[PDB]
Amino acid sequence: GPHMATGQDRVVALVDMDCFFVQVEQRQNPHLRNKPCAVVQYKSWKGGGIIAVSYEARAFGVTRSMWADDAKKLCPDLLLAQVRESRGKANLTKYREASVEVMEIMSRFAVIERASIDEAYVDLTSAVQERLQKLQGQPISADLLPSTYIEGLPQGPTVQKEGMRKQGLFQWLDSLQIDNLTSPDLQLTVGAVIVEEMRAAIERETGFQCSAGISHNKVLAKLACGLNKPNRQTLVSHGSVPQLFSQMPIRKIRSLGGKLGASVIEILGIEYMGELTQFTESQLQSHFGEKNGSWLYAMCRGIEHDPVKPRQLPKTIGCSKNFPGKTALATREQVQWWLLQLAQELEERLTKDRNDNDRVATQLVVSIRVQGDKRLSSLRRCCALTRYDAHKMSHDAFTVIKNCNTSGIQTEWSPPLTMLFLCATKFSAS
DNA sequence: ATATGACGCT
DNA sequence: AGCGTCAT
Numbered sequence A: 001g002p003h004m005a006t007g008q009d010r011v012v013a014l015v016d017m018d019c020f021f022v023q024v025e026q027r028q029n030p031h032l033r034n035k036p037c038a039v040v041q042y043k044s045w046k047g048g049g050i051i052a053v054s055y056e057a058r059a060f061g062v063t064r065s066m067w068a069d070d071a072k073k074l075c076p077d078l079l080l081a082q083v084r085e086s087r088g089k090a091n092l093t094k095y096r097e098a099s100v101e102v103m104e105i106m107s108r109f110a111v112i113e114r115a116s117i118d119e120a121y122v123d124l125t126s127a128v129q130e131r132l133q134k135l136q137g138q139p140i141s142a143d144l145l146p147s148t149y150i151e152g153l154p155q156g157p158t159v160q161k162e163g164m165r166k167q168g169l170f171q172w173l174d175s176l177q178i179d180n181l182t183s184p185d186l187q188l189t190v191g192a193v194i195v196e197e198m199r200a201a202i203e204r205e206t207g208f209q210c211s212a213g214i215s216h217n218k219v220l221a222k223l224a225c226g227l228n229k230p231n232r233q234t235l236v237s238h239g240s241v242p243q244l245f246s247q248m249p250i251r252k253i254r255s256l257g258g259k260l261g262a263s264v265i266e267i268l269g270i271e272y273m274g275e276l277t278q279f280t281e282s283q284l285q286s287h288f289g290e291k292n293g294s295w296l297y298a299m300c301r302g303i304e305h306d307p308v309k310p311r312q313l314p315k316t317i318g319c320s321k322n323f324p325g326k327t328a329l330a331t332r333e334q335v336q337w338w339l340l341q342l343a344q345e346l347e348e349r350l351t352k353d354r355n356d357n358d359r360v361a362t363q364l365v366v367s368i369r370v371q372g373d374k375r376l377s378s379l380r381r382c383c384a385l386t387r388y389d390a391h392k393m394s395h396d397a398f399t400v401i402k403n404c405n406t407s408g409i410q411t412e413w414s415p416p417l418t419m420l421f422l423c424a425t426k427f428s429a430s
Numbered sequence B: 001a002t003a004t005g006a007c008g009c010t
Numbered sequence C: 001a002g003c004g005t006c007a008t
């Protein structure tokens, strides 16, 4: 009873940039600001594949994955910006550099774990402690929280959204024990105040807006972040979890969006995260394994222990390209040439990495996909990465995959290759 | 015919 | 080591 931990030990935030590639293009080109807008790669097939969408465009039903020509049928005024193309492939440098701007600002507040090109987790537990002693039991003003939502509030005994926001925040603050420095809810509130500040600094210094989740672990933080996007932050407290989870589809929780999530639904005959509570940990372990069962048992009670790993930099650097359908590489010369293109971008990125971050990759991984295999990768092999030299790197990769070629003729390659992928890995200090 | 990155399993 | 899962 007093021995049951509640997963309330930490304050953890997840910050995610609003329509990130779109914002990067909109900052560069004022003409695209406050417009239905999308970022697109490869204008040649159906106008390009959409990979990011402004919220004005979303309101017309434009989504990621969609072809640009089809997006124009839903939204004829849609403005587009194209991904840089270098060496015959998509080049994401602009967005990687924009990402670094954001991560450096967040780094100033606390230790971040970079989770994607546009998001990081933040462990606020220490910052909240320090901010709490400087505050000295002084009540927290709703003015310190001008973009914050308290999930599940307002409740009990207004028409438009900002009215509802404030009402819920007033209820939350009015209930707040500012007397006890170790109250979990109080810790979350102070965490929210800091994330208000962090998000203001990001906007001020970059022009980019973002949303945030503030809770006790990574999973709740990521879930909370999405609940009030764009340009808003959401606090999910321990106590909000039962109602929140009671109608929350299983697939919405991080790691349960694929096969395992589907098997939980299937095997257990449930739909919502909260329904998991009626199962014993041993029952869950028997159906899904020791670690999965353990993790589900605690998670459906809002408890999770994945720590925020102190890592602002990626652990691999990679370049890939699909060669779909009729463009699938079918000769030795095409394979070699495209491996050189990939190796050339890779080298440019590794040398920049070695100078910026005082480390060097030591292993090269080569990955291909062949026509008809619908796996991401058909095959992976590796070799030593000794020199940041594109010509050597591509030669080495060709060497380690050449024998996949099932062809009779010298100059032909079969089966045709639908993807090439070079990944530098196993970094070491230098 | 939609470019990446992290991590688990064996 | 090489493959399978899940993610943006």
Ligand SMILES: Nc1ncnc2c1ncn2[C@H]1C[C@H](O)[C@@H](COP(=O)(O)NP(=O)(O)OP(=O)(O)O)O1
Residues within 6 Å of the ligand: A016, A017, A018, A019, A020, A021, A022, A051, A052, A053, A064, A117, A118, A229, A230, B003, C008
């Ligand atoms: N399948 C994919 N292929 C290529 N790039 C992608 C991608 N998914 C995302 N990106 C790139 C482009 C994206 O801009 C960026 C961040 O991805 P999100 O945070 O999942 N989506 P956004 O930040 O745009 O919208 P909001 O967060 O407001 O919902 O990563």
Ligand SMILES: [Mg+2]
Residues within 6 Å of the ligand: A016, A017, A018, A019, A020, A118
């Ligand atoms: Mg985002």
Ligand SMILES: [Mg+2]
Residues within 6 Å of the ligand: A016, A017, A116, A118, A119, C008
């Ligand atoms: Mg994101």
